[PDB]
Write an enzyme that holds these catalytic residues in place. Structure first.
Site, PDB file in Angstrom:
ATOM      1  N   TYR A 164     -20.075  17.232  -5.992  1.00 55.69           N
ATOM      2  CA  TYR A 164     -20.162  18.545  -6.656  1.00 55.69           C
ATOM      3  C   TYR A 164     -18.882  19.334  -6.422  1.00 55.69           C
ATOM      4  O   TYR A 164     -18.179  19.183  -5.415  1.00 55.69           O
ATOM      5  CB  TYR A 164     -21.382  19.313  -6.240  1.00 55.69           C
ATOM      6  CG  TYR A 164     -21.305  19.847  -4.850  1.00 55.69           C
ATOM      7  CD1 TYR A 164     -21.623  19.039  -3.728  1.00 55.69           C
ATOM      8  CD2 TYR A 164     -20.825  21.144  -4.546  1.00 55.69           C
ATOM      9  CE1 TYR A 164     -21.493  19.494  -2.459  1.00 55.69           C
ATOM     10  CE2 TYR A 164     -20.698  21.581  -3.207  1.00 55.69           C
ATOM     11  CZ  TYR A 164     -21.052  20.729  -2.185  1.00 55.69           C
ATOM     12  OH  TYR A 164     -20.964  21.127  -0.859  1.00 55.69           O
TER      13      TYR A 164
ATOM     14  N   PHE B  79     -15.534  27.738  -4.331  1.00 53.85           N
ATOM     15  CA  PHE B  79     -16.086  27.992  -3.006  1.00 53.85           C
ATOM     16  C   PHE B  79     -16.469  26.740  -2.241  1.00 53.85           C
ATOM     17  O   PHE B  79     -16.641  26.824  -1.007  1.00 53.85           O
ATOM     18  CB  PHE B  79     -17.265  28.981  -3.001  1.00 53.85           C
ATOM     19  CG  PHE B  79     -18.471  28.529  -3.745  1.00 53.85           C
ATOM     20  CD1 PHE B  79     -19.464  27.777  -3.121  1.00 53.85           C
ATOM     21  CD2 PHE B  79     -18.678  28.883  -5.072  1.00 53.85           C
ATOM     22  CE1 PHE B  79     -20.571  27.345  -3.871  1.00 53.85           C
ATOM     23  CE2 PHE B  79     -19.794  28.447  -5.775  1.00 53.85           C
ATOM     24  CZ  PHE B  79     -20.719  27.698  -5.151  1.00 53.85           C
ATOM     25  N   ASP B  80     -16.600  25.593  -2.922  1.00 51.97           N
ATOM     26  CA  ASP B  80     -16.969  24.372  -2.213  1.00 51.97           C
ATOM     27  C   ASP B  80     -16.701  23.177  -3.111  1.00 51.97           C
ATOM     28  O   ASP B  80     -16.757  23.266  -4.339  1.00 51.97           O
ATOM     29  CB  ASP B  80     -18.447  24.481  -1.803  1.00 51.97           C
ATOM     30  CG  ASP B  80     -18.899  23.512  -0.789  1.00 51.97           C
ATOM     31  OD1 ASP B  80     -18.092  22.770  -0.211  1.00 51.97           O
ATOM     32  OD2 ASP B  80     -20.129  23.511  -0.550  1.00 51.97           O
TER      33      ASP B  80
ATOM     34  N   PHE C 126     -21.760  25.121 -11.099  1.00 49.89           N
ATOM     35  CA  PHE C 126     -21.532  23.830 -10.470  1.00 49.89           C
ATOM     36  C   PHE C 126     -21.270  22.783 -11.510  1.00 49.89           C
ATOM     37  O   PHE C 126     -21.898  22.723 -12.567  1.00 49.89           O
ATOM     38  CB  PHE C 126     -22.752  23.377  -9.680  1.00 49.89           C
ATOM     39  CG  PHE C 126     -23.064  24.226  -8.475  1.00 49.89           C
ATOM     40  CD1 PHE C 126     -22.453  23.979  -7.237  1.00 49.89           C
ATOM     41  CD2 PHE C 126     -24.007  25.281  -8.554  1.00 49.89           C
ATOM     42  CE1 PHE C 126     -22.756  24.779  -6.141  1.00 49.89           C
ATOM     43  CE2 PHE C 126     -24.289  26.023  -7.448  1.00 49.89           C
ATOM     44  CZ  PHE C 126     -23.690  25.785  -6.260  1.00 49.89           C
TER      45      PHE C 126
ATOM     46  N   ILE D 200     -30.330  25.103  -2.537  1.00 51.35           N
ATOM     47  CA  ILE D 200     -30.747  26.201  -3.389  1.00 51.35           C
ATOM     48  C   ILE D 200     -31.722  25.670  -4.474  1.00 51.35           C
ATOM     49  O   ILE D 200     -31.669  24.506  -4.913  1.00 51.35           O
ATOM     50  CB  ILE D 200     -29.578  26.985  -4.021  1.00 51.35           C
ATOM     51  CG1 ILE D 200     -28.646  26.029  -4.857  1.00 51.35           C
ATOM     52  CG2 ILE D 200     -28.848  27.721  -2.960  1.00 51.35           C
ATOM     53  CD1 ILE D 200     -27.633  26.800  -5.702  1.00 51.35           C
TER      54      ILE D 200
ATOM     55  N   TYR E  82     -28.501  32.213  -3.905  1.00 52.43           N
ATOM     56  CA  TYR E  82     -28.500  32.911  -2.604  1.00 52.43           C
ATOM     57  C   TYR E  82     -28.945  34.364  -2.713  1.00 52.43           C
ATOM     58  O   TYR E  82     -28.905  35.105  -1.716  1.00 52.43           O
ATOM     59  CB  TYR E  82     -27.157  32.792  -1.906  1.00 52.43           C
ATOM     60  CG  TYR E  82     -26.805  31.376  -1.593  1.00 52.43           C
ATOM     61  CD1 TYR E  82     -27.306  30.763  -0.442  1.00 52.43           C
ATOM     62  CD2 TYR E  82     -25.978  30.614  -2.414  1.00 52.43           C
ATOM     63  CE1 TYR E  82     -27.031  29.441  -0.144  1.00 52.43           C
ATOM     64  CE2 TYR E  82     -25.642  29.300  -2.082  1.00 52.43           C
ATOM     65  CZ  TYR E  82     -26.184  28.732  -0.947  1.00 52.43           C
ATOM     66  OH  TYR E  82     -25.927  27.431  -0.583  1.00 52.43           O
TER      67      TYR E  82
END
Ligand SMILES: [Cl-]
Ligand code: NA
Ligand code: NA
Length: 128
Positions: free
Chosen positions: A45, A55-56, A118, A75, A101
């Site tokens: 991902y 962010f990731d 994503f 999530i 979140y």
């Protein structure tokens, strides 16, 4: 770009039909089977905020992210969205905060009330 496209052109995959999780299939996967509740799922991902910041990314770590599907280990948008994927599929997911979140956010990088984008690849899934 891709976030705008999924926002405007994605499919609502929620059971509530509240547009909280929108999906576009980018690469069609194999066969017809989707993973089962409790399966070990392996994904790659990348995640972006609505301000464009990444962010990731599991790609950057050279290892997939592994979780048990349908157990609240991720999530809610991921439990719902990965359950729709075929092995080898790549999709885009747009996740409103109620499926992510919420007002809490997640330190260090995810603010309160954040809509998240994503790209997810379902590498594999295995039961027991
Ligand atoms: Cl883009
Ligand atoms: Na597009
Ligand atoms: Na699918």
């Amino acid at each position: 770009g891709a976030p705008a496209t999924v926002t405007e052109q994605g499919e609502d995959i929620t059971s509530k039909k509240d547009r909280g999780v929108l999906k576009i299939v980018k690469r069609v996967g194999n066969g017809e089977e989707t993973p089962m509740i409790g399966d070990k799922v392996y994904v790659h991902y990348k995640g972006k905020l609505s301000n464009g910041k990444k962010f990731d990314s599991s790609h950057d770590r050279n290892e997939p992210f592994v979780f048990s599907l349908g157990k609240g280990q991720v999530i809610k948008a991921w439990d719902i969205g990965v359950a729709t994927m075929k092995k080898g599929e790549i999709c885009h997911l747009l996740c409103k905060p109620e499926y992510a979140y919420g007002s809490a956010g997640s330190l260090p990088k995810i603010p309160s009330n954040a809509t998240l984008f994503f790209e997810i690849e379902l590498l594999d899934f295995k039961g027991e």
